[PDB]
Amino acid sequence: TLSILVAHDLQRVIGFENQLPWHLPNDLKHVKKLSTGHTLVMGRKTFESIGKPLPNRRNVVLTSDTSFNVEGVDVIHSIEDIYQLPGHVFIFGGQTLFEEMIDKVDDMYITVIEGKFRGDTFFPPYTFEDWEVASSVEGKLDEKNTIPHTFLHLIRK
Ligand SMILES: NC(=O)c1ccc[n+]([C@@H]2O[C@H](COP(=O)([O-])OP(=O)(O)OC[C@H]3O[C@@H](n4cnc5c(N)ncnc54)[C@H](OP(=O)(O)O)[C@@H]3O)[C@@H](O)[C@H]2O)c1
Ligand SMILES: CCc1nc(N)nc(N)c1C#C[C@@H](C)c1cc2c(c(-c3ccc(CC(=O)O)cc3)c1)OCO2
């Protein structure tokens, strides 16, 4: 099972200057629930933006750097290596990896941020006539979660 896992805004912005443009704690909880116990695969720049591996799951980093080596991180050097990872594998980002994999994944867990942010990195365009809506759940707004957002589970038709 190969899935995308992404938060993107109304124009599909996912990042600005190596950071998330927005602060949404509920989306962090969403990611932890989905991916604890499984595998995250991310590009090198996504990994550097996080700083360190995320706990209690396998962290796989794709890079051409043969010197890359981080305690708690498994390194792969080819897209093809992804297809040798067991278990449930989530493509975690960023733009380059999403572009490489959106045509390969079985399904996508998208958090749509219902806002328009300045970005320099984007999720690729997709059309809902390629993807069925398995579920769509509005995120709950409160003091610490103040941007409207929707959790989609899209499965390839
Ligand atoms: N909103 C979200 O859900 C979310 C999630 C993740 C990331 N992001 C954002 O996305 C942005 C970063 O995305 P990005 O496109 O700049 O970078 P990226 O996709 O994270 O990383 C690109 C790097 O990955 C490696 N790579 C990609 N394909 C490869 C291949 N086929 N073989 C070997 N290595 C490969 C290369 O590393 P080397 O150059 O070292 O060889 C390349 O430089 C950040 O702003 C981050 O905040 C957002
Ligand atoms: C949470 C944002 C997000 N949402 C969805 N829908 N899909 C994604 N791919 C990402 C992403 C991402 C990368 C860019 C990133 C950058 C960061 C982060 C975290 C992050 C930190 C803690 C958790 C909670 C956990 O799992 O323990 C989850 C994500 C993740 O924090 C520093 O900057």
UniProtKB/Swiss-Prot annotation:
One of its GO terms (biological process) is tetrahydrofolate biosynthetic process. InterPro entries: DHFR, DHFR-like_dom_sf, DHFR_CS, DHFR_dom. The keyword Mitochondrion does not apply. This is Dihydrofolate reductase. Substrate binds at residues 5-6, 27, 49, 57, 92. Pathway: Cofactor biosynthesis; tetrahydrofolate biosynthesis; 5,6,7,8-tetrahydrofolate from 7,8-dihydrofolate: step 1/1. Belongs to the dihydrofolate reductase family. Pfam families: DHFR_1. Residues 1-156 form the DHFR domain. It comes from Staphylococcus aureus. There are two DhfR isozymes in S.aureus, this one is chromosomal and is sensitive to trimethoprim.
